[PDB]
A paper describes a structure:
The point centromere of budding yeast specifies assembly of the large kinetochore complex to mediate chromatid segregation. Kinetochores comprise the centromere-associated inner kinetochore (CCAN) complex and the microtubule-binding outer kinetochore KNL1-MIS12-NDC80 (KMN) network. The budding yeast inner kinetochore also contains the DNA binding centromere-binding factor 1 (CBF1) and CBF3 complexes. The inner kinetochore centromere-associated inner kinetochore (CCAN) complex (14 to 16 subunits) associates with the centromere, generally through specific recognition of CENP-ANuc.
Previous studies identified an interaction between the essential N-terminal domain (END) of budding yeast CENP-A (CENP-AEND; residues 28 to 60) and the essential S. cerevisiae CCAN proteins CENP-Q and CENP-U. Reconstitution studies further showed that a CENP-QU module can transmit force from the outer kinetochore to CENP-ANuc. We also present a structural explanation for how the CENP-A N terminus (CENP-AN) interacts with CENP-QU. Unexpectedly, the CENP-AN binding site on CENP-QU is autoinhibited in the context of the assembled CCAN. Paradoxically, in the context of CCAN, the CENP-QUFoot is sterically blocked by an N-terminal domain of the Nkp1-Nkp2 dimer. (B) Cryo-EM map of the CENP-AN:CENP-OPQU+ (COMA) complex. In this structure, the CENP-QUFoot and adjacent coiled coil, including the CENP-AEND binding site of CENP-QU, are mobile and not visible in the cryo-EM map. In our structure, the N-terminal domain of Nkp1-Nkp2 is bent back, so only its middle region binds to CENP-QU. The remodeled Nkp1-Nkp2 releases the coiled-coil domain of CENP-QU, rendering CENP-QUFoot accessible to bind CENP-AEND. Although the CENP-QUFoot is not visible in the cryo-EM map due to conformational heterogeneity, this structure, together with the AlphaFold2 prediction, explains how CENP-AEND can bind CENP-QU in the context of Nkp1-Nkp2 and in the absence of CENP-LN. The CENP-AEND–bound CENP-QU could represent a CCAN-independent axis of inner-outer kinetochore assembly.
Author numbering:
A (entry chain U): 233 to 266, 277 to 321
B (entry chain Y): 1 to 86, 110 to 123, 136 to 238
C (entry chain P): 153 to 176, 179 to 285, 293 to 307, 314 to 366
D (entry chain Q): 277 to 303, 320 to 391
E (entry chain O): 162 to 181, 201 to 331, 351 to 364
F (entry chain Z): 1 to 72, 86 to 153
The structure:
């Protein structure tokens, strides 16, 4: 029942983490002694770039509204 | 069916002969680096503890148990594949079908590989589309933002004249700051002006 | 009665009604809602909504004004024509952003001495440079597609100084480290691997 | 039950794997992951499904889907196009001169 | 005065009512009928000798568990109210997908494709009549696992009309 | 828990270090031989030999396993596998068609927001205004 399911999960996760440990050993050897990404399969720069793009020139927030809320407030405090 | 178990039994006997030749390989490896009389003595302790460990009945019982496990593995394989004759359930049943009348077997293996490729590319494309959907959502939010902000529907030129509005706002800020510096000259007024300038600039 | 539901049920949320009015059968409500978690730049929202005063039913709901911070972010969200997916998806967004900036600040506090560490984006991406190894931890919160909850996407990117490695294998590495550790100790193990002078 | 106790010592002899830091904390580790996967709504960089002794041929995948080859070049065109539009804004200079 | 304040508190769908103890109140707003669902009350008790919350009374349906999921977060360490909010969010997601399934059934009934129905408490053995062949289906959460024809859950409407003509 | 690690248990308990420890043949070779310090050296030699036989045994075990499973209605599943192959490629065509619309949308947006204008000329004005503001703040 649940015991055999737990044993099956154990037998799966053992080979999972020993494969993981071999990958960490390989990367540690690579790092101390010295893998590349030159394709388009899963790259995360797109969403970061877009989220910066919209926040820089947001017509509600952006910079021009912030600079306006700075300088008109300074003019109100001065005049 | 029983020929499979016969081949398992002959290979088990072959591996036992491999083990005894490996014991002889211990014997002639330890020769030279150890005295041969010491080698014969440790061979004697190997006989009186380790040689009887591979009993004749136990290896055959293990071979029979392995054959029964392989037969029930084949039965389970048949059960899943006959269930598979009849979206994520398809990819699941594909990744649990095993790997293997020579032409049918070769084409089964080849198209099995070519269909694991399709199953993998499925979640590859799914993750890519899940990213691009959020990208287009933010882009559409920005476009409707500038559309109903200016209420002029000329948003293509909005991204071209933003530099001019930016620099004239900076020039007005610079003129106001110069007027405040040359007019007020007070430490608390300058501190308050600097605090108000630096509050909403980044924070 | 009032005070407990005011604060402890929804911490760092400011609820306040602005105006009430009754017509003839429709009743109109004008209200503002402020999420004051990030007190440096909090964000609020204003709604106008309608009941019957018997079997209170939202006929129509409209946006009067949104604060300057989230007036773009809360527009793609607010096209679903369902408030329970529009105000249970903003508090979670605020809480997720708070946890993101807290995790990044705590990671600054554990690397500001030996290494250098800053934020490339506003709070989304964090860059740590050591020796000349570089690590970048991305924490993307993007709105639901148009489920309904805000979307958090943790990513890593490690350069040895000269070149970038593969993203899929490091993604599996991140999967394992977060899987048996979690978001904080897993990234701590990842930046320990970035150091790797002893451990 | 008995085999579970036989497997506990397998866990103990397993957990001394070759790593100084990244295996020395999971001796509430995965339950922390299941606790914060929902609290942050976290589904992270999801690993591609099991290879099953077939190498993950990304070349065959990009051959089978011809759309992504155009998507990546459209994205690169957008990035190279208006990163220069960012560079004409001096947001970093303003943030440096103010805070 | 206070009445509109409890309406504002109740539109969320997750509320915590103090007691002398706790009570989590859950309601799911329906987009179609423009009305809230039945209020689900979870009266939660704190252990004295263990310093951790545990379930005292529940008004949940038997299909939705409030104990297994309750110990699925933080290893049963539900002392912090953030973990209570996590449990509330998880059971709210389960409630809204179950309500979505029930609304799909009600919409297909209102479309008059089938005859009168008998909906159950678990939305698995919901029976209905078709013009010639009455089909019973064993269905999990948004997934049918058996279609017992004798004479994705939304994808049924993809194919049942195909079976209708 | 399948048969290959049953073979591994059957070979590991029949390995020499198991119930014949270092102390066992150390006591058995006390007065029998003179190389007492070399007993430890022969012992790590024993671990080395045991260590690479317990790696080369898997080669033959898995070779015979894949040979027997390779030699394992029959032709009925081929038509079903072509049915699945025709199903999934048409299924992925839907995602490809969905991606085409989004990438055309983003390509239209990128040329909609491009501004081939004098950004650098405004950049010098912004830099000059920032320098004047910095000078005023330093004087403040």
């Amino acid at each position: 029942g649940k015991d055999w399911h737990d044993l099956q999960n154990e037998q799966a996760k053992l080979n999972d983490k020993v494969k993981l440990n071999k990958r960490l050993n390989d990367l540690t050897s690579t790092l101390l002694g010295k893998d590349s990404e030159d394709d388009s399969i899963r790259d995360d720069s797109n969403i970061l770039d877009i989220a910066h793009f919209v926040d820089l020139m947001d017509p509600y927030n952006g910079l021009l509204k912030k600079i306006n809320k700075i300088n008109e407030n300074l003019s109100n405090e001065l005049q | 069916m029983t020929d499979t178990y016969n081949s398992i039994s002959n290979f088990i006997e072959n591996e036992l002969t491999a083990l005894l030749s490996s014991d002889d390989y211990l014997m002639d490896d330890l020769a030279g680096e150890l005295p041969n009389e010491v080698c014969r003595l440790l061979k004697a302790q190997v006989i009186e503890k380790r040689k009887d460990a591979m009993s004749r009945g136990k290896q055959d019982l293990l071979s029979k148990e392995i054959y029964d496990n392989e037969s029930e593995l084949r039965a389970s394989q048949s059960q899943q594949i006959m269930e598979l004759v009849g979206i994520e359930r398809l990819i699941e049943d594909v990744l649990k079908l095993p790997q293997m009348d020579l032409k049918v077997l070769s084409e089964y293996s080849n198209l099995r590989k070519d269909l694991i490729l399709k199953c993998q590319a499925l979640q590859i494309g799914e993750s890519k589309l899940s990213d691009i959907l959020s990208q287009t959502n933010s882009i559409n939010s920005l476009t409707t933002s500038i559309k109903e902000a200016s209420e002029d529907d000329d948003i293509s030129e909005y991204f071209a004249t933003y530099n001019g509005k930016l620099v004239v706002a900076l020039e007005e800020m610079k003129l106001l700051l110069e007027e405040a510096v040359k007019t007020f000259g007070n430490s608390p007024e300058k501190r308050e002006k600097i605090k108000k300038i630096l509050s909403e600039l980044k924070k | 009665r009032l005070s407990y539901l005011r604060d402890h049920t929804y911490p760092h949320l400011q609820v306040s009604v602005q105006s009430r009015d009754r017509v003839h059968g429709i009743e109109v409500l004008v209200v503002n809602y402020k999420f004051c978690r990030n007190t440096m730049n909090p964000f609020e929202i204003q709604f106008k909504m309608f009941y019957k005063f018997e079997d209170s039913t939202l006929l129509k709901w409209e946006i009067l004004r949104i604060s300057t911070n989230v007036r773009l972010k809360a527009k793609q969200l607010l096209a679903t024509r369902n408030f329970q997916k529009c105000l249970l998806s903003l508090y979670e967004f605020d809480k997720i952003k708070s946890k993101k900036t807290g995790i990044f600040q705590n990671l600054i506090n554990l690397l500001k001495r030996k290494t250098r560490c800053y934020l490339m984006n506003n709070s989304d991406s964090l860059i740590v440079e050591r020796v000349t190894i570089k690590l970048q931890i991305n924490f993307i919160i993007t709105m639901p597609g148009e489920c309904f909850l805000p979307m958090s996407k943790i990513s890593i990117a490690l350069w040895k100084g000269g070149e970038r490695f593969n993203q899929i294998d490091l993604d599996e590495i991140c999967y394992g480290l977060i899987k048996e550790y979690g978001v904080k100790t897993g990234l701590k193990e990842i930046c320990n691997v970035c150091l790797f002078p002893d451990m | 039950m008995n085999l579970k106790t036989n497997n506990k010592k397998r866990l103990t002899e397993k957990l001394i794997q070759k790593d100084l830091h990244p295996v020395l904390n999971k001796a509430d580790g995965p339950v922390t992951f299941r606790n914060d996967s929902h609290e942050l709504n976290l589904m992270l960089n999801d690993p591609i499904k099991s290879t099953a002794d077939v190498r993950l041929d990304k070349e065959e995948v990009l051959s089978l889907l011809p759309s992504l080859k155009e998507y990546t070049k459209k994205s690169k065109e957008l990035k190279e196009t208006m990163g220069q539009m960012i560079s004409d804004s001096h947001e970093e200079e303003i943030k440096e001169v103010f805070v | 005065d206070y009445i509109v304040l409890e309406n504002v508190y109740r539109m969320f769908g997750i509320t915590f009512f103090p007691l002398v103890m706790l009570g989590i109140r859950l309601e799911v707003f329906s987009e179609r009928t423009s009305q809230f669902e039945k209020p689900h009350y979870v009266l939660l008790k704190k252990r004295i000798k263990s310093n951790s919350w545990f379930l005292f009374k529940h008004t949940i349906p038997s299909f939705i568990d409030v104990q297994g999921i309750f110990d699925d977060t933080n290893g049963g360490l539900v002392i912090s109210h953030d973990d209570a909010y996590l449990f509330a969010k998880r059971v709210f997601l389960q409630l809204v997908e179950v309500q979505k399934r029930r609304q799909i059934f009600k919409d297909l009934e209102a479309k008059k494709i089938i005859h009168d129905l008998d909906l159950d408490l678990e939305s698995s053995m919901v029976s209905f009549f078709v013009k010639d062949i009455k089909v019973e289906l064993f269905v999990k959460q948004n997934e049918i696992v058996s279609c017992s024809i004798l004479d994705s859950l939304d994808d049924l409407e993809l194919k049942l009309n195909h079976s209708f003509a | 828990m399948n048969s290959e690690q049953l073979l591994h248990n059957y070979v590991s308990d029949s390995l020499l270090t198991t119930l014949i420890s270092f102390q066992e043949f150390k006591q058995q070779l006390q007065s029998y031989t003179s190389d007492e310090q070399q007993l430890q050296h022969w012992y790590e030699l024993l671990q080395a030999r045991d260590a690479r036989v317990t790696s080369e045994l898997e080669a033959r075990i898995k070779q015979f396993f894949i040979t027997l499973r390779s030699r394992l209605s029959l032709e009925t599943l081929i038509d079903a596998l072509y049915k699945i192959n025709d199903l999934l490629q048409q299924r992925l065509q839907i995602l490809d068609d969905a991606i085409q619309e989004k990438t055309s949308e983003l390509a239209e947006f990128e040329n909609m927001v491009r501004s081939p204008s004098a950004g650098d000329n405004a950049i010098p004005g912004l830099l000059q205004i920032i320098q004047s503001y910095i000078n005023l703040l330093e004087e403040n």
